[PDB]
Design a protein around this ligand. Sequence first.
Ligand SMILES: Nc1nc2c(ncn2[C@@H]2O[C@H](COP(=O)(O)OP(=O)(O)OP(=O)(O)O)[C@@H](O)[C@H]2O)c(=O)[nH]1
Ligand SMILES: Nc1nc2c(ncn2[C@@H]2O[C@H](COP(=O)(O)OP(=O)(O)OP(=O)(O)O)[C@@H](O)[C@H]2O)c(=O)[nH]1
Ligand SMILES: [Mg+2]
Ligand SMILES: [Mg+2]
Lengths: 167, 167
Amino acid sequence: MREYKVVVLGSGGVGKSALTVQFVTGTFIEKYDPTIEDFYRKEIEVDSSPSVLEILDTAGTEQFASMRDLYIKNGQGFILVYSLVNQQSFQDIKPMRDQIIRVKRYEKVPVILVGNKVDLESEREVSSSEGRALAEEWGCPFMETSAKSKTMVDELFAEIVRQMNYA
Amino acid sequence: MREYKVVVLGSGGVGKSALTVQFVTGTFIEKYDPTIEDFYRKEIEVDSSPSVLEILDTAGTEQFASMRDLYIKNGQGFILVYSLVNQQSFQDIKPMRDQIIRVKRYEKVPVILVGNKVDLESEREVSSSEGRALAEEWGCPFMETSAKSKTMVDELFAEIVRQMNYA
Ligand SMILES: Nc1nc2c(ncn2[C@@H]2O[C@H](COP(=O)(O)OP(=O)(O)OP(=O)(O)O)[C@@H](O)[C@H]2O)c(=O)[nH]1
Ligand SMILES: Nc1nc2c(ncn2[C@@H]2O[C@H](COP(=O)(O)OP(=O)(O)OP(=O)(O)O)[C@@H](O)[C@H]2O)c(=O)[nH]1
Ligand SMILES: [Mg+2]
Ligand SMILES: [Mg+2]
């Protein structure tokens, strides 16, 4: 019920592009192509409401550090992704919300914390309760996902819309 | 039908309530009763699609920036009114759209600029060129109206619906 600008942030290879491409195409990318800066748009029915999601999928590998503030300035909603099989990506996510609040200057920014790659949880490095405790401290929702399933990815994107709708 | 939440903004005595009640009930109100806050609901056919409007008619006297931020938060479309026979009400409207964007956080907010009381044009203090220039700077439609005109009032609410169908 408006245009929704979501920025997906997180370190290299956590599955930011696989999550966005699952949402947009219903396909799973199996190869790893490091992202420069990709924009997607899709219509979605969130609780029957028409919502045009515009998704900025950013670079994680070496990111584009200085520019991240520009991405944050322009974003309305933020999906903070880590890989649950990579402890370091989780650690890398911990300053991200503070950086968002710094750029935006207000505390109630719509964010979701995502632990991705749940289908690889035989090699889990970060437990649900850890992710969930970070999200609780931030006051935002926590989800765990696999970019392999359309269903999990659709609820992710549906939820960020609800968070942006209620701010 | 879809819901359209519309907020009517501007300075004291420009005719916000009179426009709203002409729209809703088809009565022109002559008495000046300063508004605190009132909600109206009304179903209109815009380009033959039924649209239901929930209109928030606001106070114009004794500003209160915080109340205005709440009014804005709940609205998806905005009608900014000045009285063409009151120059100060036109200058008063000029910060208003910027406050709207600030509160909303999204850039392309549906707005129409209205110079009301065109029936009292013998006392016009704000020319059509001026009002039209502010609207061309804002990139929004401009209208001059009279609350005594069912035709102009219905075209005003019809047009805010069209703008909200855009963004
Ligand atoms: N098994 C599995 N692999 C995943 C999943 N999500 C991502 N991958 C794989 O992990 C690799 C990286 O995924 P990308 O989406 O390219 O990672 P990214 O976060 O976009 O990386 P950058 O663009 O470099 O920041 C690819 O080989 C993906 O197939 C998932 O949930 N399950
Ligand atoms: N002649 C004429 N009078 C108008 C018109 N619109 C409003 N008025 C009159 O101007 C006075 C104020 O109108 P309201 O609609 O109450 O003004 P308002 O903007 O709601 O004022 P607040 O609620 O105090 O902010 C009343 O006497 C109205 O009848 C119009 O188009 N023509
Ligand atoms: Mg990528
Ligand atoms: Mg009033």
